[PDB]
Amino acid sequence: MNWTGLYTLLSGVNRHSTAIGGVWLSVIFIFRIMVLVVAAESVWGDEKSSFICNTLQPGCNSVCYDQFFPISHVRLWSLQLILVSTPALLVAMHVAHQQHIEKKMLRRHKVHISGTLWWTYVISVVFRLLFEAVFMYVFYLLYPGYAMVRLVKCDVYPCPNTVDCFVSRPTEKTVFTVFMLAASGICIILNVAEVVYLIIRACARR
Amino acid sequence: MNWTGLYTLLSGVNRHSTAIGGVWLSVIFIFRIMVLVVAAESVWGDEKSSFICNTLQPGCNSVCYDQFFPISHVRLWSLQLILVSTPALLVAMHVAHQQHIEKKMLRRHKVHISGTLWWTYVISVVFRLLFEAVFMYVFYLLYPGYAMVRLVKCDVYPCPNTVDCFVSRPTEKTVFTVFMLAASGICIILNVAEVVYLIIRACARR
């Protein structure tokens, strides 16, 4: 967590920025990171010992938790943040290597190289948008809606009876889920707007 | 936690400051951050195992805690701090992008752009004030007053009898709640004063 390094990396100013992209996208990314960290360290936490089921035979609780919860929300959000951040750092090191090549040249074709850099930036933005969309889809597929069930009836082996049990903190997890979904949706909208602005600028150049 | 980066970000000097805003607001923000960190790591802590209820049937304690405590105070305070900090970092990266545009121009309209930056700063201050007010309202709605109840009578399923149980540390949580509320109220007052000072300056310009 550094103030100087985070701006030089997450913003992704690169060749050109629309003042509707890197700034707002970086703001939403930082908000998402902070909310995810708070959710992971505090409310989900261990999220395995807290889930307790009314049974005496050992191992029923563990297998039941995996049956009802295949992959936790925090894992999905962390994976999504990593995947979304990947194109930004990609273009950041790409620009660093481009400036290294420029300083090597110091020690027509350059215009073409810069144009290729612009194309890489555009395709990176598109890939980030697709990653966000597919992560929203997989989140919808794994969990319907937004609310979290409180009581679950368990029948898997080795649970000898249809015991019922409870989730750790339903309401806090619901609130944080709503926050994360809203932030991701705003990020998708901002990315689409940035792509449209880039298309408008390209048409204006022509 | 860095001395140099925190001032360049939290202060939000931006286009102009009234010497009644960024300095005092940043001081109160740092105090709030430190108090929240101390409260989270030390007194609330896990805040789930400590809450113990006089019952033998497993799962009664967990569901009872969620019934009485929907969302913990620490979660509300952390969410409020993130939401309040969001406009400050927003204007910080906005000014960074503006200076990037300025250095690009180096490599009438500028006055208009700077005026738009000033308007963005003003609207960011207003949004921060509204966020603080709505967080105070939701805190009041969730918990009446400031003191924390010590003994709670539990009747939810699967608690077979109306067992009664106790909170971990009532007095320390009460003190920290009072501290957090007082700091937030002072922050709201300071924000309102800054808005009034900005209005006075704008009228003086006219």
Add this chain to the structure above:
Amino acid sequence: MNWTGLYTLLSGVNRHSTAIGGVWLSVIFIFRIMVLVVAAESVWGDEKSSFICNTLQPGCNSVCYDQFFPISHVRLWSLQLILVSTPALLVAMHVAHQQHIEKKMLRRHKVHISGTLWWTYVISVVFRLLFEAVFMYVFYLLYPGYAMVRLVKCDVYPCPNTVDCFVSRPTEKTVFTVFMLAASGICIILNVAEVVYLIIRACARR
């Protein structure tokens, strides 16, 4: 924890220093911070599971601990450190904003502004002294003397019998309490000496 940032902030050199103030006060502050960190992470630690009472009915131990210990020593010391540090960072960001105003002016009244800065520094020192004194008073009020009781007789509900129980580590806590009190007293003496020196300098100016 940074060497460069801590000196530029905790020293509070500001407009003027007496070479009896910021240096010695910063030294005692750093010593207090280190001792408090050592006490919190190591000896008090969790300070809730360690406190064990001879009872079988659950919840007796928890409520008994709050009855005998309303607010822990570590919480009081951390609160005192935050409150004492608040004026120092206050004047630090105040001087940062003053130098920002100076660089803006670069891009009679200045003497008056600097005098107001000096007055703010003086009033900040006074407020720090008052905070230290009131924290010493509240520490005395909550706990008489310095030694820590070892055996406590508990009679609160739901403890069915007058069971007796023991504190985790009496002697280490006693030693750290003595250290913290001595450091705070030395800090108060140093602050009073600095105020007297400032008064002497002001009279010398007149």
Add this chain to the structure above:
Amino acid sequence: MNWTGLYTLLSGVNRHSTAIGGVWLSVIFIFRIMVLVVAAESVWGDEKSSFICNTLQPGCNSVCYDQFFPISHVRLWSLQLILVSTPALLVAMHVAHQQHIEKKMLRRHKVHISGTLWWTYVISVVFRLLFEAVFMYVFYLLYPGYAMVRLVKCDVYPCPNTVDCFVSRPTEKTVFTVFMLAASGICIILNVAEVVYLIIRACARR
């Protein structure tokens, strides 16, 4: 975790880069590091207490876990990351020492020394590729395929009966295993492409 230091070390720009190597390889390395950290701290975690087996005789669970799981996936991935990172930091300190020798010379043969540096870079890339390949092979040898078994029948001493027991989180571990394997395969492909590009450049020089 620093933005400035990580680029100057992991990129391995060295004597020359193909703009297909250090940038993409560093991106995949950072992604692998983040995924491994998330997997270690969150999903595998302790990975010993979570593995619970239906037995009452103590020590059966512990020895059974080692029988079925000789070395954990997280340990293999961390070892692989360290081994792969070793040549990169090797060439980084090698270039630092080369520039130290250059500044000493400041205070024909130089061309030969630079050529030897280029050869060291090439052999380092080859060694990194071999390390990646051998780690993939050992991962395949230890665990067949990618899916993780859920129920295991245990017969080792001192487990008096053929008790059966369950893994902590099969599906999350499966997903993270797939992620890690895909990232490593992409890294191997990129390394092979970089070696081929270096061979093409060498032939072009001749």
Add this chain to the structure above:
Amino acid sequence: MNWTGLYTLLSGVNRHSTAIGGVWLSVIFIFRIMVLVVAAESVWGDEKSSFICNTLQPGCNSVCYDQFFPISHVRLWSLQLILVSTPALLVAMHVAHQQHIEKKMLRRHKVHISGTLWWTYVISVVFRLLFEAVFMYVFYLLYPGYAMVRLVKCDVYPCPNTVDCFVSRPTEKTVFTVFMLAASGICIILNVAEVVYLIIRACARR
């Protein structure tokens, strides 16, 4: 933990150094810090749950541990390190304030001020030596010799019978105790040598 800041602070070069002082003393101080950190986080650790006694009545183990171990070795070593480090940071901020006064003068008496700084450095070295000696004495007083007892017979209330119990890790603690004592003794010898060298230099000046 920073490379640049630690040298500028712990060395205490100040007005003058004998090349037998700050360098070797800083080396031994860093070694002591590392050994203490390793001992605290790893071998002593919690050092309360590990100490287990053969009794069923609760609270016997806790009070027995305090009876036999008044203050832990790690606490004594950390206190000694803080107290020894205090004069070094004292003279460091003193020199910082002196250079601030010098830059203020830029914006006979100076020789006298520098001589007073030299006297402060000498008295700080003496105080560090006295602190080291008194800490060695208190360590000897609290624990005779160096070896750690393994079996202790406990008779304090509320232990109804003279139960006997065992320390967590005798041999590792013995080794680390020997390391810490040897390092402290070497530090005392080095401080005495530095004082003697300073006296010799002062006589040479006369």
Add this chain to the structure above:
Amino acid sequence: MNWTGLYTLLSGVNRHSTAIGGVWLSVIFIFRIMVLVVAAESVWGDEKSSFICNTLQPGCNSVCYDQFFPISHVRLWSLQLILVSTPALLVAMHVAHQQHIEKKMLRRHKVHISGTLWWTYVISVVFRLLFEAVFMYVFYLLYPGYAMVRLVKCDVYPCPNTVDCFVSRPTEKTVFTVFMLAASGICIILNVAEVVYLIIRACARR
């Protein structure tokens, strides 16, 4: 963990380097540090609760663990790393003080001082080699060979019967032991080669 500081300290470039020493030795040192950290935090971990023995009388397990394991492998490796790092930081602060003396001189004998610095570097290298060798010897003395026993028969008091019990993770510890031993052996070979190269250079000078 900083990229800039670690190179300026661990490399130990000092007066002169053979390009066979500081670079390769620093690489192996960094690898050893990373492997030790991974081994400590993950596989050995607590290494006390995991060791479980088939007994009901409390205290048998604890004393039995100390009987079979006097000092853990992780403690030996950490001690060895600290002892080996001590000469490197020694010469680093020595060179810092030498350059301070040089800047003081700026504000025949110098050749002799530089020669003494070279001799200090040589003797530091020799001491590092001796420390590595003696640590290998003590590791061999404490544990024969490399494999870790799985089942141990315990007969010490207060274990009323010759109960047998198991180590936590034999195979992972075996692998990490082999890694650590191989890295240390390579480091010894590199140190011997550096000493021989220094002798060859000294003879070449004569």
